[PDB]
């Protein structure tokens, strides 16, 4: 078996090999890059993701998400409190700001520390969730806006033909933003380019320990587990790598720079944090692989969730007896 020990790959694919991208991650997979979870791939130093970024400061950020956390400093939840619209060059000077920048710091382990020692006691604000590319078009490789869509993998695989949609979102940062513990929708795959700005730390557990850490959280939040048979997919729940350790969860850590991607394979459960002023750009995607872990993926019904559109299809084709008590919880 490949990667037994279920580390974090990282790949410097050639300009050859970076011209096809199904066969790409099916080469990684090849490797056990799966096995951890989480991959980076560093492209080709001939490629490029778009030629500048200097005129992207008009771009609309509707609404703002205040990250305001309850709870104790390695154990904690948080909630998006709604602020008012404001540009990527308005959101840039925030961050840098007295108030919201990174503080000094030595190295990214001195920088982890202080996340996890002071985290809860600040409120930054995301930009997450934003629908759009930063890709030119004429980039044709790993371009996050050209892929196969999922709907089509579907088809190809199973033969029926769906309704939906499949486009990516830009996520800009700030020092102490956070992405809480969960996997993606119906344990889809996703892919992440960082295309500017300062890191991003990424924390995941293997596939196949997914369900300790879930036994975990039901005990580290009692009252959210008796409300929802799934309340990671609630995306509020945060665990820091000294309570995982002290609970011989097994998991691991990399950090993301400008430049690079990073793939989450089905059922890793992911979180982290960003180290400063960034924008990332992120979809799922799907591969034949995928699809007997979409067969098998939980679902929130408490209702809380509330996910695309194109989420629908996925269950009603893939999981038809959860079908009705899901879309309940969707209206
Ligand atoms: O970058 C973020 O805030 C969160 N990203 C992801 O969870 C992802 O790419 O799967
Ligand atoms: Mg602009
Ligand atoms: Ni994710
Ligand atoms: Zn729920």
Redesign the pocket.
């Known amino acids: 078996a490949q990667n037994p020990n279920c580390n974090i790959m990282i790949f410097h694919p050639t300009k050859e090999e970076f011209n096809d991208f199904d066969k790409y991650i099916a080469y990684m997979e090849s490797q056990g890059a799966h096995r951890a979870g989480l991959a980076k791939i560093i492209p080709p130093k001939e490629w490029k993701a778009r030629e500048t970024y200097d005129?992207?400061?008009?771009?609309l950020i509707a609404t703002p998400l205040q990250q305001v956390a309850s709870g104790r400093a390695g154990v904690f939840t948080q909630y998006h409190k709604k602020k008012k619209a404001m540009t990527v060059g308005e959101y840039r000077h925030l961050a840098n700001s007295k108030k919201y920048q990174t503080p000094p710091h030595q190295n990214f382990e001195d920088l982890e520390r202080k996340y996890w020692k002071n985290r809860i006691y600040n409120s930054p604000i995301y930009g997450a969730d934003i629908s759009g590319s930063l890709f030119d078009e004429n980039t044709k490789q790993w371009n996050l806006g050209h892929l196969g869509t999922i709907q089509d993998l579907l088809e190809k695989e199973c033969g029926v033909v769906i309704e939906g949609v499949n486009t990516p979102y830009l996520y800009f940062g700030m020092w102490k933003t956070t992405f809480a513990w969960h996997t993606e929708d119906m344990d889809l795959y996703s892919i992440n380019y960082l295309h500017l700005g300062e890191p991003k730390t990424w924390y995941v557990v293997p596939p196949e320990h997914g369900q300790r850490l879930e036994r975990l959280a039901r005990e580290l939040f009692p009252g959210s587990s008796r409300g929802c048979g799934a309340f990671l997919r609630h995306k509020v729940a945060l665990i820091s790598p000294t309570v995982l350790k002290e609970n011989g969860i097994p998991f691991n850590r990399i950090t993301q720079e400008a430049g690079e991607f990073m793939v989450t394979f089905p059922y890793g459960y992911h979180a982290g944090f960003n180290h400063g002023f960034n924008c990332a750009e992120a979809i799922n995607f799907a591969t034949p692989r995928w699809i007997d872990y979409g067969k098998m993926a939980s679902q929130c019904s408490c209702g809380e969730a509330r996910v695309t559109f194109s989420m629908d299809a996925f269950v009603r084709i893939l999981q038809p007896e959860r079908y009705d008590l899901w879309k309940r919880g969707q209206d």
């Open positions: 005129n992207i400061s008009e771009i």
